[PDB]
Each structure stands twice: as C-alpha cells, then as structure tokens.
Swiss-Prot record, chains A, B:
Gene Ontology cellular-component terms listed: cytoplasm; plasma membrane
Organism listed in the record: Mycobacterium tuberculosis (strain ATCC 25618 / H37Rv)
Catalytic activity: (R)-pantothenate + ATP = (R)-4'-phosphopantothenate + ADP + H(+)
Similarity comment: Belongs to the prokaryotic pantothenate kinase family.
UniProt-recorded name of the protein: Pantothenate kinase
Pathway: Cofactor biosynthesis; coenzyme A biosynthesis; CoA from (R)-pantothenate: step 1/5
Gene3D superfamilies assigned: P-loop containing nucleotide triphosphate hydrolases
EC number(s) per entry: 2.7.1.33
Any GO BP: coenzyme A biosynthetic process
Keywords carried by this UniProt record: ATP-binding, Coenzyme A biosynthesis, Cytoplasm, Kinase, Nucleotide-binding, Transferase
Gene that this sequence comes from: coaA
Amino acid sequence: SEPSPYVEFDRRQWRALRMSTPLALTEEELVGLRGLGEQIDLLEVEEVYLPLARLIHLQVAARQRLFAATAEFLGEPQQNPDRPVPFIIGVAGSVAVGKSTTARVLQALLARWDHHPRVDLVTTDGFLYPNAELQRRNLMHRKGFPESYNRRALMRFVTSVKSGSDYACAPVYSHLHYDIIPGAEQVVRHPDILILEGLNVLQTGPTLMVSDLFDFSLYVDARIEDIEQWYVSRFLAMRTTAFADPESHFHHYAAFSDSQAVVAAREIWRTINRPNLVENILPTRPRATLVLRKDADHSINRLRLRKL
Amino acid sequence: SEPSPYVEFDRRQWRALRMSTPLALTEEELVGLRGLGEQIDLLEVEEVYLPLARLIHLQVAARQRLFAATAEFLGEPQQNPDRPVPFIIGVAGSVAVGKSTTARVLQALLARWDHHPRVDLVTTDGFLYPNAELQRRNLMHRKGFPESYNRRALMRFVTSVKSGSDYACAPVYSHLHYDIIPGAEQVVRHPDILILEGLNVLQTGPTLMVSDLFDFSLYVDARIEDIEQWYVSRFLAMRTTAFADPESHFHHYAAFSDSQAVVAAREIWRTINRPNLVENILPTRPRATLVLRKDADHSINRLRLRKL
Ligand SMILES: CC(C)(COP(=O)(O)OP(=O)(O)OC[C@H]1O[C@@H](n2cnc3c(N)ncnc32)[C@H](O)[C@@H]1OP(=O)(O)O)[C@@H](O)C(=O)NCCC(=O)NCCSSCCO
Ligand SMILES: CC(C)(COP(=O)(O)OP(=O)(O)OC[C@H]1O[C@@H](n2cnc3c(N)ncnc32)[C@H](O)[C@@H]1OP(=O)(O)O)[C@@H](O)C(=O)NCCC(=O)NCCSSCCO
C-alpha cells in the first residue's frame, strides 16, 4: 500500500494496451526507418510502439483544453481557422542507445492517424555550435555536452513553435562532415506535434529550459555496459559504412583494423560519451514521462510510466 | 517579435481579468486571515486575487481531463461516485515575504465557488524534523534549509493524496514551541484542491520531488532588501506578541530593547534566512506558474504568468 508516481510494465502486459489501434506500417517501411545496429521488427512496433502512439494521441487532445483554458482567461481570440497549440515531445537517451530510430518510428506512427496530424521531427544536433565556435571556445573535446549546444537558440526555436508562429527555422547538422551545414535550414510550420530528439533535451536548469515546454517525454534506457558495447560495434561497422565515403570527417578510420578500432572507440567512449551520459543524461531519467528499457539484444522488454 | 513563455502584467491590467467573478469575502473575514505585518485590503483581494481564483478554476477543470486520458489508456475503472484527481497548488517564497497570508486568502476564495469545492491547506513546516532529530543531525542552525525537512514523508504524503487515497496524515508544527507537536496530526481527505505552502516546495532535484506533482505554482516575490526589513520589523513586533507568552521558545526575546532586537534579528537573517533564500528559494522563481511581485509597502503591483 505504498503509492507511487510510477507504474511499471513488462512488455507482455504493456502489449495489451494496444486495444483496437491499427498497424499502418509495413516491414518494408520499417527497414528504411531502422538505424545502424537496431534490431526493431514489426512485432516490437506492435507490442511496444502502438500502445505508445495510442497513449500520446489520447493526451494530445486533453492537453489542448489546458492551453485553451489559459487563452480563455487572458481573453485572447480563438480566431480564424482554429490552430491548436503544438504538442511537444522530447526524446532523450545516450549516444548509440537507439533514440534516433525510436523518434523516427514514433513520427511515422503518430502521423498515420485518422485525422492526419502534421508531425515534424527535429534533431537537436542542428543546434550544436559549428566546429569553428567549438574550437574557438575550447570545447571540441566536449561535443555532445550541454555547453556544446546553443541553448538560447534551441529554446527560442521551441518557444516560437509552441507560441503559434507561422514558421520557425532550425540549423541542419551533417553527421558525415561532423559539422553544421552553412546556410542549410529546416523549416517547421505550425505542426500538430513536434518531436525533438537529442542528448540534452531533458536537461533542467537555473533558468527555464526546453524541457519545461515538453508536453510528454521519453527516455531510451539500457545498461551502461550494453550501450558501450553497441557504441563500439557501430563504430567498427561504420568503417565499411560512413567512414568509407572520402568526405567523412573520419575517413582515416575506415582503414583501422578490428583491433585498433576497438581500442579507439573505447577511449572516445571512456573519455567523452560515458562521462556525458553519467553526468548529464542519466540524471534526467527520473523525470521522463516514459522510460523504454532496452535489453542486451536491443529489444525493449520493460517500461516505466509516470501516471503522476 | 521575440516570443516568450512569460506574460507580464501591471496590476492595472491584471485587474481587468476579473470579469464577472463575485467577491465573496468581507473586510471582517479578511482581518482574521491577515498575517502579522501584512497590508492586504479588500481592494487588493479584488484586483489581484479574484482574477487569480478565476484562472485556477478554469485550469482545475481542464487538468482533470488530462489525468482521465491516462486513466482511459490504462483501462482503469472510472467507478462509483466519480472522484476527481486532486489539483495540487504549490505556494512558495522567503520567510516573512507573506506567503502564509497569500495561501490562506487563496484557500478561502477557491472554496467559495458555485460548486463548493473541498479545499485544504497544508503548511510544510509540519514536515520539518523535530528539533531532536535536528540537533541529532547537527542541523539546528539550518532550520528551513532543504535538509531540515523529511523530504521522503512530504513526497509520500502528496503522492498519497493525488493517487486518490481515502485519507492521508501530515504532522503538525507549532511556531510557538518552535517544534513538532508530538502525536498531533492533520487529516486530509480526498480534497478537490490541495494547497501546499512552504519555503522548499518548488525545489527540484536529482530525483522526482513534490514540485513535479504540482498542477500550479505561485511564488511570492519581493526585493531581498525589503524582505530583510519586514523580517526585522515582524521580529520587533513579536516581542509584545508571540515572544510574550511564556511558553514561547523565544520568551527571552520579548525583553530585548529596540536596539538589541534589531541587531539580533539581522544576524539570524544574515546567517540563516538570507542564505537559504539566495541559495535554495530564489533559484526556483523561474519555474513558478505565477510570480506575485510585492513592493516595499507589501502591495502586489506586478505579476508574471507562464502561458507556456
Ligand atoms: C555528434 C554527436 C554529438 C551526435 O550525437 P547523437 O545523439 O546524434 O548520436 P546518435 O548515436 O544518436 O546517432 C544519431 C544518428 O547519427 C548517426 N551518426 C553518428 N555519427 C555518425 C557519423 N560520424 N557519420 C554518419 N552518421 C553518424 C547515427 O548512426 C544515427 O543514425 P541512424 O539513426 O541512421 O542510426 C556524437 O555522435 C559525437 O560525435 N560525439 C562526439 C564523441 C564521439 O562519439 N566521437 C566519435 C565520432 S565517430 S564514432 C560514431 C558514434 O559516435
Ligand atoms: C520555523 C521556520 C523555518 C518557519 O518558516 P515559515 O516559512 O513558516 O516562516 P513564515 O515567515 O512564512 O511564517 C509563517 C507563519 O508562522 C509565524 N511565525 C513565525 N515564527 C513564529 C514564532 N516564533 N512564533 C509564532 N509564530 C511564528 C509567522 O508570523 C506566520 O504567521 P502569520 O501567517 O499569522 O503571519 C522559520 O520561521 C524559522 O524559525 N527559521 C529559523 C531561522 C529564524 O528565523 N530564527 C528566528 C526565530 S524567531 S523570529 C520570527 C520570524 O522568523
């Protein structure tokens, strides 16, 4: 009889909350959404993601009445073709934990609902300072840490979108060139649902931050030991993948041998990513609305929901 | 064209948001609710508090649909006589800023609405460890700081109430005896609205805290210089008030002269309360849903609302 803000589910119980929700995704489309190293299949989409999509849509509708109440108080006009306040979803997790895939799969699913919602996906890597500013601030070795992002611009972007602005722009990042793409821009136009995915997104602070504007948040979790192993493996697999293309900022890596690669990946992990995870990311897991616990084989078998 | 999560109002503009809301409080009743040193009159109740009560009730109704959505997702029965999820309001501010009064006035106003809501008020001083445990943990000089409260019990209490438990108990504190009253208990029974008032209430942490369960929060603000002066004045006025009664843990103070008192109050303030304000309380003001800015004369002339 010890009340809790959380409710924990094993996959076998969570799958039942799917109810009647239709599966509108083919094994073909899932393939194009799957990230390097991910093992998600159609069954996992069905037993884990479908009930997630249902939970979200139930909340989107209810969350709108809350903002409408504030609008009615201020006496601000609900004029023209009524445009809903965007619903903002934060997706966080460590590097290589698979949050990229999760965000993409969730977008596809959320968009294929009867009322055809406009669902955008924005990765926060577009707000990392360009390498120039990075090495000009002596932060090239802290890329991924909270200080490597233009927190002001990020906050300004999300505030703009949720305030109901007609359009807002976000910088575009290129993982290949390991840097910001000069002049490139992603345009977001009053979406019904905006999904923001990144390492930092749930970070709280002495000031109001982007996480305070989230209407729902998910954390992609795994044992730190397992994440390290996925990191190292994706690293090796990239030698014949991204590191292959000459433009790659890490071409010199595509040549490494299985032995050197492992030693190289583990250090980058030990000195840069692991510290960031432990110090900045893991501390936000307690506040996430929904935690997705992955197992050694990438499979999500456990979930923790905040009902309070 | 710089979007903001905040909206600032001068009293003259805020007063207009009262709309038709009836004033159901007499100057007589207001007298009994007013704390030592407070200057709140019926006009202030009308121009500042009435629109506040209206904002809250508009939100109470909308907030219920949100929890209902989660309930519908989990497939949990909306059985019997439908009992709403309690709406939790946090009221924070420094010592002597006047938050006690604000909380009491707000309770009275919220309760006198057409549907007769059950509105309870719980001060968190009932969760301060007894002086015994305090001096047993070497914290008697940090009374009021976050470490002086039983954060676990406080969180357990609020979680219990909002989870829908039939009843929950909170310890009772006695300002006179400067300590917890052994055996005394305040019983809270599934209220429609629960108001929690204290110094710590908005504190965030590495773990889920009481502030994460709040549905609305207000911060009672004033210039630190002015708060210091109110502290010192209330102190002097208490010599002939509370410090008079022999039981008072500070009887020896009722004898002090205007000169000594001032020097004594200022040090307690300088060494205990001011530090707590600067280090633990002020840092939470950015997250409060509504900030009430008091002026040197205790009058509230400015407000800052989070519409996002
Ligand atoms: C740039 C930054 C901060 C980006 O963080 P993210 O949260 O986006 O990383 P995350 O693991 O989520 O990857 C997101 C996507 O970005 C992909 N990606 C990551 N690094 C590269 C890359 N170098 N080239 C091409 N694609 C890449 C990754 O495979 C995901 O794509 P898929 O959804 O198709 O699978 C991080 O990857 C980084 O480089 N941190 C500095 C420390 C470090 O790891 N240095 C070694 C760089 S080469 S090893 C590649 C794995 O880090
Ligand atoms: C015990 C504690 C933590 C309580 O914090 P609170 O947030 O409840 O203080 P706050 O200023 O909000 O006072 C709440 C009510 O509690 C009243 N009060 C405060 N101290 C006493 C007292 N000693 N005797 C009787 N009533 C008191 C105060 O007048 C308010 O009543 P009203 O609503 O009728 O005006 C704080 O007052 C304290 O004693 N902190 C330790 C440092 C300190 O100030 N020591 C000097 C104690 S004698 S000076 C009285 C003002 O502090």
